[PDB]
Amino acid sequence: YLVPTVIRAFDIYSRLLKERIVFLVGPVTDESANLVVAQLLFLESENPDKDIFFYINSPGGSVTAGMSIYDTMNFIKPDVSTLCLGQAASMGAFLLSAGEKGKRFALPNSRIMIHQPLISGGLGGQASDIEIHARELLKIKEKLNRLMAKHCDRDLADLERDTDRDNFMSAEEAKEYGLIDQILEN
Amino acid sequence: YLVPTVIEQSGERAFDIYSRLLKERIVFLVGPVTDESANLVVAQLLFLESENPDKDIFFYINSPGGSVTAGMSIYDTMNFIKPDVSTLCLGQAASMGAFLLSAGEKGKRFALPNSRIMIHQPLISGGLGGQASDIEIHARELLKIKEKLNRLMAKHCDRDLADLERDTDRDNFMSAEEAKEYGLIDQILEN
Amino acid sequence: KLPTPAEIVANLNDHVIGQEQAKKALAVSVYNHYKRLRHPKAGANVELSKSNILLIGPTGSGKTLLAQSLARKLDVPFVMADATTLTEAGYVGEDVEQIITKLLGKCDFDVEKAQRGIVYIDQIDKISRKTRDVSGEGVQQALLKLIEGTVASVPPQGGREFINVDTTNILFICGGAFAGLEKVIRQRTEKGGIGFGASVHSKITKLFGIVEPEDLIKFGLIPELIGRLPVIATLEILDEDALINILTEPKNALVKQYQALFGMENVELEFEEGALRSIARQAMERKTGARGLRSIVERCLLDTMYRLPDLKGLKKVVVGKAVIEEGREPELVF
Amino acid sequence: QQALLKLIEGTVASVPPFINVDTTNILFICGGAFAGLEKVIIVEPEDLIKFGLIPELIGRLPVIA
Numbered sequence: 014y015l016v017p018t019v020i021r022a023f024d025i026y027s028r029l030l031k032e033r034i035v036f037l038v039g040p041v042t043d044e045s046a047n048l049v050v051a052q053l054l055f056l057e058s059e060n061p062d063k064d065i066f067f068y069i070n071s072p073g074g075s076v077t078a079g080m081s082i083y084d085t086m087n088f089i090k091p092d093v094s095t096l097c098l099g100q101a102a103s104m105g106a107f108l109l110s111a112g113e114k115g116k117r118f119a120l121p122n123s124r125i126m127i128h129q130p131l132i133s134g135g136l137g138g139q140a141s142d143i144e145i146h147a148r149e150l151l152k153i154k155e156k157l158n159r160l161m162a163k164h165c166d167r168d169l170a171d172l173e174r175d176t177d178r179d180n181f182m183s184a185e186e187a188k189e190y191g192l193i194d195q196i197l198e199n
Numbered sequence: 200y201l202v203p204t205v206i207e208q209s210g211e212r213a214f215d216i217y218s219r220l221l222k223e224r225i226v227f228l229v230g231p232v233t234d235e236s237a238n239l240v241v242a243q244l245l246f247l248e249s250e251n252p253d254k255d256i257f258f259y260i261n262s263p264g265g266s267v268t269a270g271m272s273i274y275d276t277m278n279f280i281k282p283d284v285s286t287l288c289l290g291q292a293a294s295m296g297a298f299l300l301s302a303g304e305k306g307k308r309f310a311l312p313n314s315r316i317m318i319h320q321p322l323i324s325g326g327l328g329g330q331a332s333d334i335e336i337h338a339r340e341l342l343k344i345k346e347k348l349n350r351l352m353a354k355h356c357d358r359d360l361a362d363l364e365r366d367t368d369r370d371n372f373m374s375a376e377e378a379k380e381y382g383l384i385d386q387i388l389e390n
Numbered sequence: 391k392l393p394t395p396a397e398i399v400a401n402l403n404d405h406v407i408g409q410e411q412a413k414k415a416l417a418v419s420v421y422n423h424y425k426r427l428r429h430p431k432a433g434a435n436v437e438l439s440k441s442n443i444l445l446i447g448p449t450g451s452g453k454t455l456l457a458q459s460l461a462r463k464l465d466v467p468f469v470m471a472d473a474t475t476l477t478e479a480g481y482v483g484e485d486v487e488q489i490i491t492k493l494l495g496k497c498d499f500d501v502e503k504a505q506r507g508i509v510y511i512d513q514i515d516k517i518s519r520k521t522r523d524v525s526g527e528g529v530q531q532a533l534l535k536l537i538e539g540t541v542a543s544v545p546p547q548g549g550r551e552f553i554n555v556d557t558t559n560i561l562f563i564c565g566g567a568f569a570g571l572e573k574v575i576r577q578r579t580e581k582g583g584i585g586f587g588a589s590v591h592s593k594i595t596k597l598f599g600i601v602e603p604e605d606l607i608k609f610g611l612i613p614e615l616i617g618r619l620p621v622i623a624t625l626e627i628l629d630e631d632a633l634i635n636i637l638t639e640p641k642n643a644l645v646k647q648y649q650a651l652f653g654m655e656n657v658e659l660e661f662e663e664g665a666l667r668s669i670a671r672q673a674m675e676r677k678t679g680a681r682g683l684r685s686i687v688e689r690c691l692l693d694t695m696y697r698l699p700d701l702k703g704l705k706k707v708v709v710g711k712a713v714i715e716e717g718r719e720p721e722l723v724f
Numbered sequence: 725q726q727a728l729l730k731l732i733e734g735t736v737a738s739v740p741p742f743i744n745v746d747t748t749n750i751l752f753i754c755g756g757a758f759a760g761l762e763k764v765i766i767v768e769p770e771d772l773i774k775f776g777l778i779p780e781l782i783g784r785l786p787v788i789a
């Protein structure tokens with residue numbers, strides 16, 4: 014794609030970074046997650062007190078990559094406000110719910126989906142190797158449900174039910190659930 | 200493709216021709232609607248609101264359709280930002296392209312005389328594999344999207360939901376005149 | 391006897407509103423200037439050097455007015471110099487000794503008086519560093535030995551034997567709008583860092599008030615010139631309230647100047663308090679300092695000034711608040 | 725622009741035939757085809773500054789015709 018230039022001449026995404034807007038668009042990968050981390054680190058220094066706006070339009074992706082964003086969001090001093098555009102699914106929904114409480118937003122027709130993780134990596138090799146990877150996946154599953162339950166002010170038991178299979182929510186349902194705080198209109 | 204460079208008189212500034220047209224508040228949606236192409240439209244819409252919240256934004260659409268969630272990121276951005284977003288159909292506005300065309304500010308939705316506008320119920324928003332329980336979930340989500348799109352279309356067109364449910368059952372191709380009569384566009388440009 | 395620094399400021403008060411510290415700095419230096427000049431110059435007495443002043447302030451803050459207002463009662467030769475016309479010795483333009491020639495002319499070439507005078511150098515910020523920088527650093531370097539005591543060799547009072555002038559006791563007041571200076575101070579005072587281990591730091595009047603040589607060096611002045619300007623006095627940026635007083639309080643207030651023009655006719659000009667604040671507010675938004683007050687007053691009065699000399703019987707014209715906020719006519723009292 | 729600042733308002737020029745000329749009382753009409761200024765925009769200093777003039781010169785030309 015050709016990224017427009019806006020007026021020093023910026024590409025339009027560097028221009029929006031100047032306004033403290035960080036985009037997570039598409040799958041969460043090591044590379045796309047590290048750019049978010051680099052931008053979050055950069056913005057903290059430019060101004061540790063001002064909010065950072067983290068716009069999410071993502072189907073999900075790697076858990077470890079999403080956790081690098083998640084820990085960076087929680088570590089840096091400035092509040093990270095999160096906004097759901099289009100969709101926030103899987104780790105995208107996790108990072109949406111991970112925004113500063115009271116500053117998690119969704120647009121009216123956005124779609125938010127939460128679910129237990131799939132393969133974090135293949136389970137081949139010997140039954141001993143498969144046991145190890147199955148145990149690691151279960152620990153991740155519990156960690157994600159526990160952090161989700163914390164974000165949503167819900168019981169761990171509720172997230173365990175609700176993430177069993179793909180749980181699609183409107184912005185209103187996500188607000189009632191506790192994934193977001195407000196729905197923007199104008 | 201090689202994107203031409205044009206010079207703006209002010210000193211001089213060299214632009215690619217699309218950045219030059221963005222300076223005139225023209226945003227293009229060309230080809231399929233994807234997360235990446237939709238986010239560029241959103242970035243441009245947000246940028247233009249900051250430059251001037253009062254002036255109209257011109258959203259030129261030549262698109263066969265694409266992802267619903269990607270199209271909804273554009274749709275919600277169009278409705279959110281203060282400036283009116285005028286929409287123009289060039290070549291075609293099909294599926295989510297027709298949705299975004301109809302989503303323009305009422306009275307400012309345009310089509311060129313020989314453009315083609317097509318509306319239809321959504322297809323797969325994602326595959327339906329796995330277990331019958333997973334297939335049930337995805338079938339339910341697709342039906343909710345189907346109803347949401349028909350409801351928003353009916354609102355755009357000042358029609359009954361029942362009319363959009365009939366008319367989007369199978370690919371419904373319309374001339375610019377038929378789209379105007381239907382309520383997808385307000386005017387047809389000639390000169 | 392000598393006037394006290396308080397008397398100098400009292401006289402400055404009739405012309406300059408605000409900038410209490412800049413008025414104080416000038417008054418004390420001039421008072422010390424006088425004292426130095428009546429100090430015994432021989433025997434066991436300590437030799438006295440001088441403290442020069444650098445005036446840092448925004449556009450339209452009153453730097454030049456201070457210098458011009460100060461000059462009205464100095465009792466020593468005083469000259470207004472301009473750094474934008476200075477160049478290196480071997481180039482087109484004026485040399486730095488041209489300043490002494492001007493100061494010397496002001497006292498009819500009585501050198502003993504010229505050596506006791508005061509020099510204001512305007513536009514000092516225009517010779518900053520940021521090849522041979524003929525009109526920039528080259529001038530700063532040339533001035534080093536003019537500000538510190540040298541013997542200037544200047545033309546005589548006739549056409550091009552030259553006059554030897556000892557500049558040791560000439561007081562120099564330099565100033566200018568160091569427009570890019572706030573960013574430097576913010577970079578020094580809000581450095582911070584990026585990344586985890588590092589710690590990130592919190593983010594015109596306040597910044598100038600904390601200026602240090604490190605900023606002037608990074609701005610573009612050379613350390614050798616900064617150290618010869620030991621006293622840095624700063625002027626704040628005028629706010630909405632200061633700009634109201636500037637319309638009516640000064641001896642040559644803006645409103646008084648127009649009342650005089652209308653007074654060359656037989657029409658009294660009156661502004662409402664709502665207009666004065668509206669004018670000050672609009673002028674503040676122009677970012678030209680006090681000067682913006684003139685644009686607003688010229689604007690609102692243009693059509694009544696056009697008609698005024700032709701109108702007969704008019705006695706008083708009132709500029710209300712509406713006449714500043716809206717395209718209204720002033721009330722005409724016949 | 726910087727050199728003109730002190731010419732527009734009062735200064736004493738050294739003028740060869742040296743003649744000392746006080747420019748305080750000279751009326752200056754300055755102008756130009758600021759075509760890029762219609763694009764930037766009822767001209768206000770904000771527009772002239774974006775055009776590329778320095779506030780110090782704008783403030784010395786109080787009347788815009």
Ligand SMILES: Nc1ncnc2c1ncn2[C@@H]1O[C@H](COP(=O)(O)OP(=O)(O)OP(=O)(O)O)[C@@H](O)[C@H]1O
Nearest residue numbers: 405406407449450451452453454455567680681780
């Ligand atoms: N503090 C003040 N009090 C009263 N009048 C002021 C003040 N500041 C500015 N003015 C008014 O502004 C006009 C010009 O001011 P001045 O010549 O001091 O600006 P300047 O210092 O030359 O600015 P620059 O540094 O940009 O040249 C005068 O009419 C003066 O009365």
Ligand SMILES: [Mg+2]
Nearest residue numbers: 453454455512
């Ligand atoms: Mg000046």
